[PDB]
Amino acid sequence: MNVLTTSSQRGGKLFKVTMTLSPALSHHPWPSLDTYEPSQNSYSVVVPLDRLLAEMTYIKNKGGRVLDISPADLEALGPPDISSVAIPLKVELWAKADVSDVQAAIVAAYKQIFGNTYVLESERLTSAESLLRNGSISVREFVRLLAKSELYKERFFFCTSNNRFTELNFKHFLGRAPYNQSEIAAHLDRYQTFGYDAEIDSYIDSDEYIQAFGENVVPYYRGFKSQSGQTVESFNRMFKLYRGDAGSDTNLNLQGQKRRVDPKNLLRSGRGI
């Protein structure tokens, strides 16, 4: 929830704690068994640094358990601006492209395909670049080479779970976020039998690709602007998947590869199968 002040009147960094409540921790003043109120199964309080230790211990000493703690400065921050992704920009590689224009497509392709993740000079792929610019490879084919590269597997696929790798793929190859568990499930199965290469192909192969940014257009963010057959929740998901500019997908951070889109949110938009 929103926090209204970052700091306590006495100087002190407020932290927002979230817990699963327990009947002991708060109970209705009724007769009969003690129940907490249902709407507050996940309760949230903002505590100064000083009371934080004691508050957390009390929570834990009862049946409570702490879902997460987060500084109230980071919390109570703007939802990310969508200025740059509202209108993506879009890059076309013409045939008979200049030296420069090919460069600019390469950069754009790295940026989108790898998340703000930085790619070092040793990481970059001379061979696949070499193919673009003398012809022979499409933009769409280059993209398929990137998502086949180890660099791609090391970041997105070898650290995290397939369930996260899926949405992580949905973002890189299509602006969209995932819509409905069905999609996540299908990719998981395809991966088990066909294996990693087939899965990657199936995004680039799919009709959304080609119908949008078909060939020779570096893929750009479609989400954040209304798409056909796209549940509304998907639009909110996009805000979880995409945090700001100069926010990335990093294996490098502490517990680097987690799931932005809670599995219960997917189930909202469509549950079945």
Partner 1 sequence: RATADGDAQTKLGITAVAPAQAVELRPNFGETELQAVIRATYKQLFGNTYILEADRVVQAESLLRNGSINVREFVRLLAKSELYKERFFHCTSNNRFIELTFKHLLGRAPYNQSEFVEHLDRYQKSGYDAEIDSYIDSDEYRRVFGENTVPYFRGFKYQTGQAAGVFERTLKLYGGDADSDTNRNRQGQLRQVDPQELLRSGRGIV
Ligand X SMILES: *[C@H](C)[C@H]1/C(=C/c2[nH]c(/C=C3N=C(/C=C4\NC(=O)C(CC)=C4C)C(C)=C\3CCC(=O)O)c(CCC(=O)O)c2C)NC(=O)[C@@H]1C
Q: Which is nearer to partner 1, 37 or 154 (CB)?
A: 37
Q: Nearest-CB residue to ligand X?
A: 35
Give whole-number Cα distances, 57 to 19, 49, 60, 64, 254, in Å: 12, 13, 5, 9, 24
Minimum CB–partner distance for residue 120 and ligand X (Å): 9
Q: Which stretch binds ligand X (CB under 6 A): 71-79, 102-110, 134-142, 156-164?
A: 156-164
Q: Which residue has the tokens 């990310």?
A: 80
* Interior angle at CA 22, CA 17 and CA 26, nearest 5: 85
From candidates 1, 5, 7, 23, binder to ligand X by CB under 6 A:
23
Given the structure tokens 């070092």, which residue do they identify? 120
CA separation for the pair 142, 117 (Å, rounded): 18
E-strand spans in 36-102? 42-47, 65-71, 91-92
Q: One symbol per residue from 190 to 219: x for binding partner 1 (CB under 8 A), - otherwise; what is it?
A: ------------------------------
Contact status, residue 270 vs residue 179, Cβ threshold 8 Å: yes
Site for ligand X in 108-147 (CB under 6 A): 116-118
Which of partner 1, ligand X, none sits in contact with 246, Cβ below 5 to 8 A by type? Answer: ligand X
**Closest CB 171 distance from ligand X, rounded Å:** 16
Interatomic CA distance for residues 72 and 59, integer angstroms = 19
The answer to whether 65 contacts partner 1 (rule: CB under 8 A) is no
Binding part of the chain for partner 1, among 38-46, 150-158, 189-197, 253-261 by CB under 8 A, reads 38-46
**Phi, psi (degrees; rounded to nearest 5) at 99:** -60, -45
CB atoms within 10 A of CB 78: 6
Rounded distance between C-alpha atoms, residue 74 and residue 236, angstroms: 19
**Cα(138)–Cα(210) distance, rounded to whole angstroms?**
12
Tell me how far, at minimum, the Cβ of 73 lies from ligand X, in Å: 18
Question: Does the CA dihedral 242-244-250-253 come out positive or negative?
Answer: negative
CB nearer to partner 1: pick between 1 and 49? 1
The residue among 62 and 240 lying less far from partner 1, judged by its C-beta, is: 62
Q: How many CB atoms lie within 10 A of CB 210?
A: 13
Q: Taking contact as CB under 6 A, which single stretch among the options 71-79, 91-99, 149-157, 183-191 is the one that binds ligand X?
A: 183-191
Binder to ligand X among 8, 149, 230, 248 (CB under 6 A)? 248
Which residue lies nearer to partner 1 by CB, 29 or 272? 29
With breaks defined as C to next N over 2.5 Å, after which residues does the chain break? none
Backbone angles phi, psi at 70, to 5 degrees: -155, 140
- Residue placing its CB nearer to partner 1 in the complex, 8 or 162: 8
Residue from the set 36, 220, 235, 239 that interacts with ligand X by CB under 6 A: 36
32 is a site residue for partner 1 (CB under 8 A): no
Interface positions with partner 1 (CB under 8 A): 1-4, 10, 24-29, 37, 39-40, 43, 45-46, 51, 54-55, 58
Interface positions with ligand X (CB under 6 A): 23, 35-38, 116-118, 161-163, 184-185, 188, 246, 248, 250, 252
